[model samples]
Target: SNTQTVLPFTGLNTPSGVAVDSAGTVYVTDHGNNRVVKLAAGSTNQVTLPFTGLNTPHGVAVDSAGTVYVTDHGNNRVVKLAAGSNTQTVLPFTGLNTPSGVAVDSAGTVYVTDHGNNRVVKLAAGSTNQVTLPFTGLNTPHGVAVDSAGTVYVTDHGNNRVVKLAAGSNTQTVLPFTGLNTPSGVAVDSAGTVYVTDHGNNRVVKLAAGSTNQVTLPFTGLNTPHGVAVDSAGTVYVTDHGNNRVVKLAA
Candidate 1:
């Protein structure tokens, strides 16, 4: 049997997103269940966080300090839930249409995939304005990740490809993975390793920073993993969408 650490199947209904913090705490968006779940650093027990009125919450991300971000898909907004607290603040973003995935950079810039609008928009670290990224043809982008080097990557779900926008460039380039079937979740480790949750293939695919080869990670038996994240220590976490739980894989 493949070695993976999973909780006792936490009754999540279509869990769609996941993220891990530096302290090993894991966060997940329990989509159909209309809530977010938390796994404290060394605990196997799952806790349903007190996020009120979440409608189809899809993507989840945690910054180093334990702050959490989620794309409230059904509510058409992004919300920030601070660490060690139960309150949530609806991010100051407007006109988001069914936003799916979200990411927070080191500088606290929030990026979200406006799924229905087919674009990535951001709210600067301390600003209240919405900045739409410069891109021409993003088709129902569902997942997004920003690396330590500031490069941004997103899964162009409708186009069946993953696209990248360089740190200081406006041009978006498709990664070398060909024929990806609904690559849903994306993440980048500190060492520049990139991971994509290839939902159609039931696997998480890994690609080195500049390498073109797509390597299927050995965390097998994944049932439509919709979200993925690498902790600061390199431990991999996947939200098993179909299985309605989260799986942990060692780096």
Candidate 2:
């Protein structure tokens, strides 16, 4: 076994979301602190936006260019920040309602779950970005993830299902039309398996690519998983919201 490495935070107060960058820097959304924490390589965690005026930050994601996007739920907007940029851009300058989760594709297109609006909004990657409500009809969307093939997977928290949208299509509901219980967070592995955190059931579920059946919980012993991610070595990490800890499961 390798030496365990722990990212330091003074004990995150209500950390809702987390993401590891391409360089392995862990970013956490500290809701209680109303800021984002960046755990740099071989260093203690640093507060990036404790005083930047973020209103109830909930979810976060990083783009290929290293741009960090944080969803300010109370403000109903996504804030953009980069490593050296002193100022951040408040996106969707017009419409957003209780955005809970956010994800960015390789092209820099952003997908955000509008929990209040019960839909997902797509923002193009550009200096002057445009917003388009792609694939509506979600009950209460929470987590969002995109695969390499341009397919998108969204967690329908209100309906308790993991919906899918194929590339270039507005239609969704590819799998898990039933049996999900208030699934919250979702993540896809390099092998294309869809992993979701079933909040209501207090467990995590996996769905193999092109398979509609529920495959097994690679591991059990989870409690109210809120978020999930896979490392380059295929280690799956799940955030146990109820237990207040993160559990690492092998593929």
Candidate 3:
């Protein structure tokens, strides 16, 4: 079956990342154009570029309140876009060397993968004052995601593995996972399943909650896929970089 190709959502230029809020509104990182665009859940006519003045933006995420978080990769910082408005505030933290991935938990705490410096930092919800360095020693971590249970997952790009940092302790479990080639983006499903983009391999694979097996989805008509995400309805969204398109596959 042919994949249903959605609109290249006008205003996107070399889009690199895609995220959806609770309302089904789609947000995309126009990497080449250096801006982020917001598309309302149902309407395709009124697309808004909420925030600009970014430098090589890589990842974007939205919390329950509609607030958006962006990884200003070139600026070495993450900025928060207040809900329903364009007003922005850069998280005041240090040691961010080319931050790449960004995610917000149910508590609204933001997690960022400091790619260049090899670490991941967590900022409490509604407060830029609290900084928690959950764990370090990562090798060029590219994408970061958290599950419903608070477990953190990171795609150690350089090391070619996904590491899990449990919610309560400082334990690092280097999953016995294999079959990845320069994995970059990661996202978790409501059922605890993990979806990873094997950039080098040109495919996205799913790993069950406690299983190590790789179940490659049927759709493989991709070219150098990068970022990945799953919406509440269980549909999978992928950034097909080389093909210059964002594809949506039904759950």
Candidate 4:
């Protein structure tokens, strides 16, 4: 049982990323237009461009501080656009090879999936030096999300599996939940349940927290969905890339 709401596409072009803040504000990465717009909850009249001049911005995430972090794919960099400010600064770490996804932990530490290089790099909250987490078996990793316990979940797109990096260790284990076809975005809910956009399969599946058992198929009939996010109310948002729109699944 779900109600769907297709967001307005007035200022959107080739939209690829969808993220929601606690206030119900949705931030979209206008990939084709090289900009990011902020839409206030339940209203399209408040569309605001927090920042622009990006080259192929793909994935986006907002921290508790309201700071915006974007994976500038074409620019080969991760940029941070401070809240309510137009100044955008590219992170100073090098060796990024076609990075695609970005996630920030509660401590403000940043985690990025080096897609082309097949690695996930971690940068401390206030530092530049990065720690390339042991990518023992990742193949073209994409979307990333961190749980309350610091557990990292990544969509190993090329491998058709979801990899989990437990908190406080470098160990990587493939989740038992299978049957995924080119999974893309991944997010953990307040209850720790994992939601994945099975892009190739054109559906979204939810896995129970700490178990391989899938609890539900919240929605389907999507078109090559890429990015996904869960707001505080447990509402699911997905980027219907092929269809050029963002769909929200009512909780």
Candidate 4 lands at a TM-score of 0.94
Candidate 4 off by > 4 Å: 215-218
Which lDDT value does model 4 have at 43? 80
Q: Tell me the lDDT of model 3 at 184.
A: 85
Candidates by lDDT, descending order: 1, 4, 3, 2
Superior by lDDT: candidate 2 or candidate 4:
4
Best by lDDT: 1
Each candidate: what lDDT?
0.86, 0.73, 0.80, 0.82
Model 1 ranges with Cα > 4 A deviation: none
Q: Is candidate 1 or candidate 3 better by lDDT?
A: 1
lDDT of 2 by residue, 54-136 (tens): 87787788876778888898888889887668888887634778888888888888888888888877777774565555666
Ranking by TM-score: 1, 4, 3, 2
Local error of candidate 1 at residue 158 (angstroms): 1.0
lDDT of 2 at 2: 24
Highest TM-score: which candidate?
Answer: 1
Q: What would you estimate as the lDDT of candidate 4?
A: 0.82
Candidate 4 pairs with clashing backbones: none
Model 3 misses residue 231 by how many Å?
1.1
